[PDB]
Amino acid sequence: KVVDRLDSQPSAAFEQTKQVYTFSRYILGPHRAVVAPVAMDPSEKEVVLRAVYRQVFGNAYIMEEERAELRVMESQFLLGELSVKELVRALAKSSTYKVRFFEGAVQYRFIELCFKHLLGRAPDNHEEIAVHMRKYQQEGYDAEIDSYLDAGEYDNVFGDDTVPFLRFRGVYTPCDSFNRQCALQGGWANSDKAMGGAALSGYNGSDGRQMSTMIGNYISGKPIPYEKVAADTPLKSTAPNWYARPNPALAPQPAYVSAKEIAELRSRVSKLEAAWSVAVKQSAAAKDTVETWRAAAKEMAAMRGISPMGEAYFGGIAQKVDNGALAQLGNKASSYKKYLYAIETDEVSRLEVDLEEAKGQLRVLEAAMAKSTPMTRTAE
Amino acid sequence: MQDAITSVINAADVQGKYLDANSVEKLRGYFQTGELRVRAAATIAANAATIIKEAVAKSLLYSDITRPGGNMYTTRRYAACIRDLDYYLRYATYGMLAGDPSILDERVLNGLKETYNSLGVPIGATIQAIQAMKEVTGSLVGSDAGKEMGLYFDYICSGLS
Amino acid sequence: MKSVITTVVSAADAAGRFPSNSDLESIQGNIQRSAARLEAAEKLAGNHEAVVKEAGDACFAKYAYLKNPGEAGENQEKINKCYRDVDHYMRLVNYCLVVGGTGPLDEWGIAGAREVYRTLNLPTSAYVASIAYTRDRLCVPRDMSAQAGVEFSAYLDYLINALS
Amino acid sequence: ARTAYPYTGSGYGSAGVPYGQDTYGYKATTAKSITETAAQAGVFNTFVKLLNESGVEKLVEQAGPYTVFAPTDDAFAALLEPHSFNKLATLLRPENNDALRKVLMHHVIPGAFTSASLMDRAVTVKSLAGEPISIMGLNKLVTAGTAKVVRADVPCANGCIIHAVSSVIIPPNYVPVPQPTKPVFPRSVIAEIAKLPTPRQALGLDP
Amino acid sequence: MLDAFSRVVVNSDAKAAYVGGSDLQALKSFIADGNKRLDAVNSIVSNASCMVSDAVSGMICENPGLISPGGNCYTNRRMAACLRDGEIILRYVSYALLAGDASVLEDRCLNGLKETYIALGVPTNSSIRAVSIMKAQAVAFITNTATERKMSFAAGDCTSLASEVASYFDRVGAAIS
Amino acid sequence: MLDAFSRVVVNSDAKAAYVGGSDLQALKSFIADGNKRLDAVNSIVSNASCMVSDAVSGMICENPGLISPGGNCYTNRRMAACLRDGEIILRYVSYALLAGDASVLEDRCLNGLKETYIALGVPTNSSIRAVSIMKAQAVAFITNTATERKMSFAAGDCTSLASEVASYFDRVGAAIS
Amino acid sequence: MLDAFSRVVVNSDAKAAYVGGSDLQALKSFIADGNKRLDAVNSIVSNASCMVSDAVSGMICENPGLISPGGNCYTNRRMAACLRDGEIILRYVSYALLAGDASVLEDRCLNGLKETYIALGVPTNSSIRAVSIMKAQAVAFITNTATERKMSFAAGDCTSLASEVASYFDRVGAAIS
Amino acid sequence: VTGAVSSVNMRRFQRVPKVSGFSAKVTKKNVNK
Ligand SMILES: C=CC1=C(C)[C@@H](Cc2[nH]c(/C=C3N=C(/C=C4\NC(=O)[C@H](C)[C@H]4CC)C(C)=C\3CCC(=O)O)c(CCC(=O)O)c2C)NC1=O
Ligand SMILES: C=CC1=C(C)[C@@H](Cc2[nH]c(/C=C3N=C(/C=C4\NC(=O)[C@H](C)[C@H]4CC)C(C)=C\3CCC(=O)O)c(CCC(=O)O)c2C)NC1=O
Ligand SMILES: C=CC1=C(C)[C@@H](Cc2[nH]c(/C=C3N=C(/C=C4\NC(=O)[C@H](C)[C@H]4CC)C(C)=C\3CCC(=O)O)c(CCC(=O)O)c2C)NC1=O
Ligand SMILES: C=CC1=C(C)[C@@H](Cc2[nH]c(/C=C3N=C(/C=C4\NC(=O)[C@H](C)[C@H]4CC)C(C)=C\3CCC(=O)O)c(CCC(=O)O)c2C)NC1=O
Ligand SMILES: C=CC1=C(C)[C@@H](Cc2[nH]c(/C=C3N=C(/C=C4\NC(=O)[C@H](C)[C@H]4CC)C(C)=C\3CCC(=O)O)c(CCC(=O)O)c2C)NC1=O
Ligand SMILES: C=CC1=C(C)[C@@H](Cc2[nH]c(/C=C3N=C(/C=C4\NC(=O)[C@H](C)[C@H]4CC)C(C)=C\3CCC(=O)O)c(CCC(=O)O)c2C)NC1=O
Ligand SMILES: C=CC1=C(C)[C@@H](Cc2[nH]c(/C=C3N=C(/C=C4\NC(=O)[C@H](C)[C@H]4CC)C(C)=C\3CCC(=O)O)c(CCC(=O)O)c2C)NC1=O
Ligand SMILES: C=CC1=C(C)[C@@H](Cc2[nH]c(/C=C3N=C(/C=C4\NC(=O)[C@H](C)[C@H]4CC)C(C)=C\3CCC(=O)O)c(CCC(=O)O)c2C)NC1=O
Ligand SMILES: C=CC1=C(C)[C@@H](Cc2[nH]c(/C=C3N=C(/C=C4\NC(=O)[C@H](C)[C@H]4CC)C(C)=C\3CCC(=O)O)c(CCC(=O)O)c2C)NC1=O
Ligand SMILES: C=CC1=C(C)[C@@H](Cc2[nH]c(/C=C3N=C(/C=C4\NC(=O)[C@H](C)[C@H]4CC)C(C)=C\3CCC(=O)O)c(CCC(=O)O)c2C)NC1=O
Ligand SMILES: C=CC1=C(C)[C@@H](Cc2[nH]c(/C=C3N=C(/C=C4\NC(=O)[C@H](C)[C@H]4CC)C(C)=C\3CCC(=O)O)c(CCC(=O)O)c2C)NC1=O
């Protein structure tokens, strides 16, 4: 049992943050919990408000002409009457949220947008999308928003005072939901006006169709392609910035690719997996030369064992050392350091590195091999 | 090969110029560090065998490359690789004394990757052994000389990769 | 990595502000304290093959029961992997002396340690015994200078407090 | 058999692989030179034509290890936008070869930088034009100034690599050559004497 | 995100090497001209308000088609977003120059910016020109060679920081391309 | 673009100097009236972005079925890609004007474009309407009879030059047909 | 979304033209029979509850395979969703007829509907038939030619609004196809 | 028989007080009563 409770459950009284958040991608990037303290400077109220406008509108410019709408409902929060959840309820039912995210949108786009705004998550399966569609169609937009906020999942996670944030749970039931979450927030330099296409389709950028991709992925269980999860993503806005043995970030696809290099690379990977699957069986059986003699040499070494200092004079000369857990058995500082070069020294591990990087080079070439007719070629 | 002095003189001569204030700046810079360079070169000449022994012990001595199937399994291959490491250390010392890595380009790196690829010598393990040698060498010669030697060690590793 | 630099420019990025005078003023202390905190870095880096040796046997001298069969250090390769962990932790302390914050410790030794040490039956008290043995054996004019010793001990006890 | 990585050699201590994978210790050179490889690649036609008529062909034909960042024909066709056009239009005039030479020479780097050499590294060097150029590939995205390499590494004869880039790199210290114009002379000798202040005006004694 | 100090730490962690005396030559030289780095960042953030309106108006007085009807900078809303864009890029470049490492630039500003403009229909030619004019202003303000503002400095050379910020700006330009 | 004009002058070429050079053909085109061709291609590259925008909006405000769902200009990708295609065609015809020759206009864009648009299901007549709109905008910019836009030129007639791009745009419109 | 008045405004904004007296003959005629437009919308929204159960039951007696086991309208849940979809399409068509412009129809209802019905496995043949029966009911209710329940109107001609709503319904049908 | 979940006000009396939030303010007024 390495994970005790999830984050959908309310937080325990023993932990300051949830246990899932301590070793997920939560500790890395700016997708963290911003709690409003109980008495606030007018300085530090704006720290909360900027995070709210960053989250609820989901990366929007918002000129101060478009802020004089919301100067009434921010004032009830600045006084200290509105909580943070009632502030996002008042902001979702305002008109600037409507004209941006409801008033040119297909219903799938609006539902998947307020899943990302009011909660930190993607649409999970189809059955939870349909219940919100039927919630809107009989009761309206106003009760549709309260269907998101006033249920179990908001108050156990955010409470009433953390601003919503993109949740890096670590425990995903439907799996793909992680890929949908990473493809819904498109990294730090994206927005929903751009990803929804509401500006190119719009007239002078206003009155845009808020269209949506990935609605074939909601209905049929057909999961998100890897390029929208690895290229533009919060995975690389909240990256660990370390040395990975396979680098997971995709290279940009090369112009002027040929089929000959793809054929030789596809032969290389097929040689490498066949070499790996036979190098596996020999490992942990014939891995060592001094392994049969490990049981033999122990009884020769067991003689002349002494406690105090100075023994093994070996004739007239006095000096001796021994007495050390690692040293009693002949090991040095280099004996534990052999595990730190295994990437480039273990015969099995070399194949596993070069298998993964030949795969990563392979995967980008057929993305470049999707374009045929007016496509000029070279000779390498 | 050209050292720092030769490089400055060449840069000045290739323009028909006399050695002006910037050349004097570089020349003074080399002349101030020359004595530290001589000290480091002497100390490295003193302890070459122990440096190579310790680098090999910390980098690839107990890995799988020394076991059957590994590059340097047999005694021929072990001796050949320790000779290679001796080459790298000696030429890095030459480059540190000269203050210029052109000797490494002319006498070491020219056609080395191709030879290793034809022989089947693993490049990553070699770079790793050179990095371990950089640790021991900087350790033995102190911070400034270690920084100087590590410059040319990293030059060799970049030319090999 | 949490350092003096990455703290003040993420506080500025979260507010959308240019680097103000407080942001420049915070890095001025990174000029003064880096004479002391870097002096311990090469001192630990050059003599790191005597500190791991002296901590590893002190761990097993406090807890001799670990060499019993069924325990964590029953055979030789487990003790070999045990000395490797103290080498890893001293390498992370060497890194944290160089960045100037607890960045590399919190990323590479602290986060997720409390799950793997409970899953693989590694006793955390035997982990903090070696770090405490390194902590009380700091001769403040002999190992390093005074402030370098303060900066070294403040990173050792941070790991001690985080592991327990 | 084993060691997925077999070795070369013969006699006792062998494995079954000839010395050098074909018994060739020191292999002949199969790659062509820079302008040769470019001219057969079929995509660097404008680059090779400019190198030939500009006189920079002599520089890149030397044995010295170079890293060339040749822009594809797409890159030269993409100069027809307004901004880059305003900076490089006067390079079409037949008397402006001296600046075309520096623009072309800015693309040649001394030393052989492979793409794997530059992963997660930021390097500053001087190109043959004498100008600093920064080459940094972070997260498998290589850049040379504002180049954005598109085809990684084409090996050439004397350890010189070719990187295909999608735009032209303007040198930093580049002022565009101005358009030719009529030479103007002053019409009035008295109109210019009226332009110069006299001593009593520098004193403040006069208007 | 990383800085100049942690950059060598992830390089040493890739080989389990301690940071030795070879590695600290590059970092103790980072401390010696740290005051020049603070003096260089202070000159940029002082005139950062003029730099955006300088660069965007230069981009206009070159491609009038942006203020043409239907153009990408035609509306007051679109002109405000372009002026807002410029300032964000100038902010992250000044973060990267202060940190001494380009890491915070290309996971918080440039990661996903290529598709952001492509999907918006933002023309990339003028995006290159708005960044290059800001780069030209940066080298003038660091080397104290602006036409009509000179700032007080201690005497010495500063072309290394100027070349560093010039190296950050074409990283931005190659990212948006 | 860059290699359109010969620029023979070279020093110590060792291939060019003391060797035969395109003196007979390259020089005559340049002498004969290249300033008019240069004002021409400048009047295209300073107006290009407004030209493709006004062209695609004229096509859309003639035929709304592409912006309807099921249309080829619906979706985020189509609007972005169609703008890109029209601008590419503009850049190639601007080069073909600058060269005084339509060979690369065949070889790099018009070679096999119609079969590509058939394989993608792109409607042809809308793109023909688009390139005719670009042809009208080009000859309007070349007669300096833009009702909205003004540049100062040295005085004279550019009628011969204007036909050139009409022949080129008709080559495009016939090759797509 | 747009209406009939703003439709000519985006047409004039594409050329920076003021809306002159030529443009207002189409809009002052939109005001003259505005009462007929309100009287036409009121006749549809009055019998909108009968129209869905009229059309969906007609689509069933077309094809008994929908209520067949495994069929798309086999479950009570699926029949309720089909009656729900019918009403949404009738709601957006009555929005578009009230606005005098089809803009709110094909970015809030039809944008993304075809691949939704493809992904769900909804058969498109019966989807066409459920819309065409509602179209036939719309022309009967606007022209007051319904078998049952006639409605009181002022005398005059209304085939223009009937042709407009017939033009909206095959837009819906071509979108779901 | 319909399916009626417990309302949110029926569930807000089971909450746990958190002093770091604004929810301290409702356990102000719950206590002087
Ligand atoms: C609902 C279903 C569900 C799962 C199956 C898991 C699987 C899972 N693991 C990781 C994330 C990870 N998963 C692994 C696991 C492994 N790497 C290896 O080399 C081994 C083969 C293997 C362990 C045996 C590692 C090492 C990471 C961390 C990657 C990183 O931190 O960069 C992530 C991304 C989120 C994160 O970063 O934590 C997910 C979804 N989690 C879930 O919610
Ligand atoms: C990198 C930092 C650094 C340190 C922290 C010390 C650490 C250190 N010193 C000693 C070794 C020693 N350390 C001391 C120091 C002391 N003994 C005492 O009783 C006093 C408390 C204290 C001085 C005030 C002495 C006297 C020895 C030699 C004998 C002994 O082990 O006690 C050892 C055992 C292995 C060896 O002999 O080297 C270690 C790890 N040295 C370093 O290079
Ligand atoms: C980067 C940071 C880093 C670490 C801190 C260690 C932490 C660590 N230790 C072990 C694994 C182990 N760690 C120990 C260590 C010890 N057991 C004890 O009783 C003592 C407390 C201690 C020695 C002093 C042992 C004995 C094992 C083997 C346990 C097993 O194989 O199940 C493992 C499992 C994989 C492995 O075998 O390496 C990991 C991740 N590794 C790392 O990569
Ligand atoms: C975190 C990083 C980050 C950025 C870099 C910016 C960049 C950025 N700009 C825009 C949005 C925009 N960006 C521009 C900018 C330009 N158009 C041009 O023709 C010029 C070349 C350039 C100005 C110099 C314009 C005009 C819009 C508005 C498009 C519209 O309203 O339709 C958007 C979409 C959101 C929106 O609609 O406002 C984003 C993400 N914002 C960020 O959050
Ligand atoms: C066609 C339209 C057009 C413009 C709008 C201007 C804008 C402009 N200025 C500069 C060039 C510059 N622009 C600035 C910016 C400023 N200068 C200051 O003194 C202030 C602090 C700040 C704005 C208030 C600076 C500092 C330089 C460098 C040279 C200098 O001014 O000393 C450049 C790049 C190089 C150049 O072309 O000169 C451009 C395009 N120039 C143009 O050609
Ligand atoms: C908290 C805010 C804060 C700052 C703004 C800087 C302020 C600052 N700059 C310099 C000092 C300096 N700054 C420069 C820089 C330059 N000189 C030139 O002629 C070039 C135009 C420009 C290059 C970019 C130089 C050359 C020195 C002196 C050398 C040095 O001190 O490193 C110094 C040391 C001299 C002194 O003032 O005592 C200080 C404190 N430091 C801080 O702590
Ligand atoms: C209902 C949709 C609709 C539109 C979007 C416009 C689109 C449009 N513009 C022009 C016509 C033109 N378009 C331009 C282009 C420009 N003018 C400038 O000054 C700018 C620099 C540049 C971008 C705005 C020019 C110069 C002409 C010719 C002069 C003119 O007719 O205005 C033409 C006529 C071309 C022809 O067939 O002969 C059309 C259809 N008109 C429409 O009916
Ligand atoms: C060297 C010259 C050169 C070109 C001209 C383009 C030509 C071109 N366009 C497209 C691709 C396309 N081209 C269009 C363009 C249009 N569709 C319309 O209805 C309008 C008539 C027109 C815009 C005005 C669209 C919409 C696509 C994408 C079709 C799709 O989504 O599959 C493709 C397929 C690759 C891709 O999808 O991106 C190619 C080769 N590419 C080149 O390399
Ligand atoms: C590198 C950039 C570059 C250019 C943009 C042109 C700019 C240019 N044009 C002309 C000169 C001219 N340019 C034109 C062209 C025209 N006049 C009109 O009224 C028509 C609108 C248009 C026809 C297309 C004419 C007619 C002359 C004068 C005769 C001639 O020199 O061709 C001249 C010589 C006299 C002068 O200085 O004005 C120059 C330098 N030349 C260059 O070197
Ligand atoms: C905003 C615009 C908007 C719409 C147009 C509708 C259309 C629509 N219908 C369904 C969902 C459905 N739609 C139908 C409808 C039909 N199947 C048939 O055979 C007939 C041809 C037709 C009825 C006349 C059925 C039967 C389902 C249920 C499929 C299922 O439950 O598996 C769904 C998926 C969500 C869900 O499962 O309920 C959507 C988006 N809803 C909207 O929100
Ligand atoms: C095979 C199965 C089958 C059915 C279930 C019915 C359904 C039905 N009715 C109409 C045709 C129509 N359907 C209606 C709808 C209504 N009429 C009213 O008077 C009410 C207000 C409302 C339902 C309560 C109207 C108004 C017409 C036009 C003619 C008329 O009724 O006056 C049509 C299209 C033309 C036609 O076929 O007649 C169909 C399929 N007819 C069938 O063939």
Ligand SMILES: C=CC1=C(C)[C@@H](Cc2[nH]c(/C=C3N=C(/C=C4\NC(=O)[C@H](C)[C@H]4CC)C(C)=C\3CCC(=O)O)c(CCC(=O)O)c2C)NC1=O
């Ligand atoms: C978890 C436990 C739980 C409950 C016990 C119920 C009880 C309950 N009822 C109401 C709300 C109400 N409750 C009643 C009920 C009655 N009025 C009468 O005169 C009768 C005595 C009695 C019915 C038999 C009425 C009439 C309202 C509506 C008041 C209004 O609309 O103004 C409310 C406030 C929320 C709302 O407005 O709907 C709550 C919490 N709901 C719950 O969630």
Ligand SMILES: CCC1=C(C)/C(=C/C2=NC(=C\c3[nH]c(/C=C4\NC(=O)[C@H](C)[C@H]4CC)c(C)c3CCC(=O)O)/C(CCC(=O)O)=C2C)NC1=O
């Ligand atoms: C002056 C510059 C220079 C260098 C460096 C050089 C290297 C060189 N290394 C060789 C072999 C070798 N080199 C190695 C080295 C290694 N094996 C490993 O696993 C390690 C990673 C690595 C040591 C660090 C081995 C094992 C061979 C023998 C190959 C064989 O016998 O098949 C040979 C073949 C000659 C022979 O031994 O007969 C040459 C010429 N020549 C030069 O002129």
